[model samples]
Target chain A: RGSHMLIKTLDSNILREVGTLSRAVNSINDIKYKELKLQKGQFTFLTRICENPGINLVELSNMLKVDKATTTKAIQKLIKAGYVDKKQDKFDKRGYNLTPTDKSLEVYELIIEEENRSIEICFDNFTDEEKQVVTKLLEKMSKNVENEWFKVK
Target chain B: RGSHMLIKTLDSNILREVGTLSRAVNSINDIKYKELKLQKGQFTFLTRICENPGINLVELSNMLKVDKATTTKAIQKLIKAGYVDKKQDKFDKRGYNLTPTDKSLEVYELIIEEENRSIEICFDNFTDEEKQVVTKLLEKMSKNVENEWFKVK
Candidate 1:
């Protein structure tokens, strides 16, 4: 009850702040996704494969914490888009390595530049010290969340 | 040079953190959208309408931070999904008053509850004090961004 009351005490401005930041940050992703014509999940799948090139769908799903069916559908869309391709792993017939096409890499570079632009726009007037403080606090909160990973895993 | 160094150091971890959080947050919306075959943008459009009812499409596009074309497509999809209805404004034929159907409200309630579950899962381990600190820091960062909006706008 007290915790609920405490959440309630957070003013509308604060709620709007969270909502605004959430929207702004996600807008960066939306631009990139639409420019590439990939759905959010499909773009995410591409990024995962870009990060871990030989990863299979099951592992990708596990790493992403989404169900396999969701991962499968997302990959299917990406495959159709020609930004993602799957090839049978020579060592494991049942497992296929999800690979990003050259086109995907080109788009990934575009996304990187766009992401930098968005971050710069978001931080246009932030002082270096202010950025440091906010970064530190965000890291602390993220660390707190990560400490529970062992239990969840 | 120092900024580049900082980017290099944080790059991999940032990518991984982004992947994880994107899944946790977007999955809630995915589950919500799939119940009616809405994409994330379409889902967000409906939610924005419900939260701030009777908002017009152009305003909705700005609030969502997407291009007018993207917003138009999402709204078209929402209309097709029977989650939204748009009628030309009586005073302005070019403008529309976007409204949610009762069916949309039912989906919206379910989506909100699912989103709350996702948030709870993310914030579960936070002590009340930690939660406040996180919320406060987010608000501060958001205000810092908003302070620069006039420059962009």
Candidate 2:
């Protein structure tokens, strides 16, 4: 309540609230995963690559809904850390796919455990129904911005 | 439609979706504000400072719910860019308050205008009630994670 004290909102702050919510959890993850060097915000990208083995850079960017540059930079860091391996996609010789190394798979296990803990923490007082409702709304809100995401810079 | 063609989700992706939504809008802003040099994600920090003139760094971190390190780095950039001023607070000589510079105030106008565009883009098909519903749920969800944020490493 200390920090939330002075905040009294008038207009809809959906964007700010969403941004802040994401920031808070990410900050927590920054602390929780610091020992493993996931503190650099590598955990999220790692999670995606571990889950989606053989995912190419552009595919990763599209799926994660971030920019190509941001994805490229993070993947580079992961490659340096030995957490990701960029293999030539056998199906397409020119295609490069991101696959987590054995080392990252082990870290992926720990990441998932921590993620579930954070999930419970985020849903502290939420009922099962509220979770579904929130999940639904966020999905809806995401699709609303779908067309905008593809718009050229 | 192009990128969302990925396989189905079996589990709750609340955190990922929230993170992705924030990233998507931020990516857009990174492109939209490229001309103004807000590409580095300074626009958000600038917005808060312009709105809350004398906010301290800690307060800004908590209110925005990001890590202190991230906030400090961004603020340093803003100070260098002439978008923010750090002044010693009179009440406590050691306390420093972050204030927006005249230069930042001008950019704040453009930022807000752009933000509203992003907002409408985000809530494209939502009815007025849906907007409120999403806002209410997101606010509730944020409070759920509030306590966890204070946990120390």
Candidate 3:
């Protein structure tokens, strides 16, 4: 095999590792939550709405770092599925607020459980000190990448 | 916003940080590579094929940690775009081998340059030691989640 060594095999596979970690977690969550009829990746949005009951689409788009259109689609699907309730904002005429339904609260528990289990797995074998450091590093990296992402967006 | 703190705002956002980092990087890459007419996320597959010219779809899938169907679609687009070549495998009659074309080589340079730029930005304030530690931690996390992913897949 020619050793041109592209991104995956580059001297640093940190980016790839991040990509792999996120994908694996998403896939596992997708499978586990399918019985709830949550479409692939819809669980993420539902969980966020459950956490921030009155959060607006714009705020959600910013928090999740996903574009507005993508957030719109997910919210629409959640509303239709009865997992999310989107009401016209009282303060802002054109804005809408998203709240989770009773059904959503029930599913939220299972989703959070899966998320915590995955987090536990991710932090397995790490000392308390290293865990603190790694978490800090990832937050920094997210900010760094977010700044650059604004350029292309 | 009620501070029930869903996954994104979990006490330790290490997982969300990883997810956001990957998404931002991917979105940035998608925008930058669109000029090359590369569809969303196709650049990743192209980069891998450029790195391993003789890699088959299955091998590429394994390396990228994506399913086989996803790999097939990406390769189909690349071949349609005149950026990849798929030929009969001499060693395995039923298998196929994938390699890049002159077009892919040209795009490879830009992709790698962007990847390095993103990597530099990610490590903007990270000292060498922190970078090493974060990279090692991510690799460990990837392996950890990968174990659970196998259960679902």
Candidate 4:
């Protein structure tokens, strides 16, 4: 067995900065949704619903790695926010199809532009060669992690 | 200005893996703390208390990059867990000095060991030179992030 040495080299402040930036990226999209008073998880669930219109709550929960209670709560929030309209499936009374409101499309377009802006900022100061190296190195590390670690279900 | 024609390739799966690993690293210490039934912020708050027993909440919140409400909430959780005991500072009724329980010390020791194990696992297959390069490179990246992006903050 190898010696276990605690690496305090990863400064917490830096980690916090990274965490905040990561959250901020999501928050930009979240703000657009919030401005419309759209419910939390509406954007994510709506995207899923668009791909599969008749997707049920249980299956969504499994795919999203969220608990059933969270999905149910999110769905309730979406319904109240007017971004989602649930209709009972004709063959199965208990099953439902979630349809997105027009406002959801508006939010999606805004999010896409915002994300592009973020990517532009991220790459703004890098040279072509440096960008290539950065991309290659990040990929190498990620591949190493994937080969070594066990993924969560 | 950097080249606009930079080559940057990203696999969607790579992004997911990085996010998952980051969360796993973050919550590792929190998991150990939860075994004591303490609240979410108790682990970090207690570490601060142990190192600086008389630290004020505002200063702690600043150091932690958390707001006052979040700091207060975490302290209340720690108080309930009995891992931290607080008292009104005689000099100021509004101030409190948080001290750790003996049981908290035991938990801290275990967390330290576990964190070491985690870092060792992260670098499991790396050669000694590779490990050195990783450590240096990570620190350098953190420094760049701080100097370039977080200086104003």
Taking the candidates in order, what DockQ does each have? 0.19, 0.54, 0.59, 0.14
Task: Rank all candidate structures by their lDDT, best first, as comma-separated numbers.
Answer: 3, 2, 1, 4
Docking class of 4: incorrect
- Which lDDT tens digits does candidate 4 get at residues B22-86? 44444443445455674244666777676566677876765554456667888888878777888
- For residues B1-153, could you state the per-residue lDDT of candidate 1 as single tens digits? 012123441222423443455444555456556657865546668877876667788888676554577778888888887888998989878999888988888877766665565455556555677667656656655654454442443
DockQ of 4: 0.14
Off by over 4 Å in 2: A1-11, A89-95, B1-11, B91-93
Least accurate stretch of 10 residues (summed lDDT) in model 4 chain B? B6-15
Candidate 1 residue spans exceeding 4 A from truth? A1-26, A29-44, A65-85, A100-117, A120-153, B1-19, B32-43, B105-111, B140-153
Q: Can you list the residue pairs that collide in candidate 1?
A: none
Sort all candidates by DockQ, best to worst: 3, 2, 1, 4
lDDT of 2 by residue, B26-61 (tens): 777888888877776688888888888889888888
lDDT of 2 by residue, A7-77 (tens): 34323588878887887888888888778877756898998887778789888888777777788899888
Instruction: Please tell me which model should have the higher DockQ, number 1 or number 4.
Output: 1
- Compute the lDDT of residue B95 as modeled in candidate 3: 73
TM-score for candidate 3 (chain B): 0.88
TM-score of chain B of each: 0.77, 0.86, 0.88, 0.67
**Winner of 2 and 4 under DockQ:** 2
Query: lDDT of candidate 1 vs native?
Result: 0.63
Those runs of model 3 whose alpha carbons end farther than 4 Å from true positions after fitting are A1-11, A91-93, B1-11, B88-94
| TM-score of the A-chain for all models | 0.70, 0.86, 0.88, 0.58
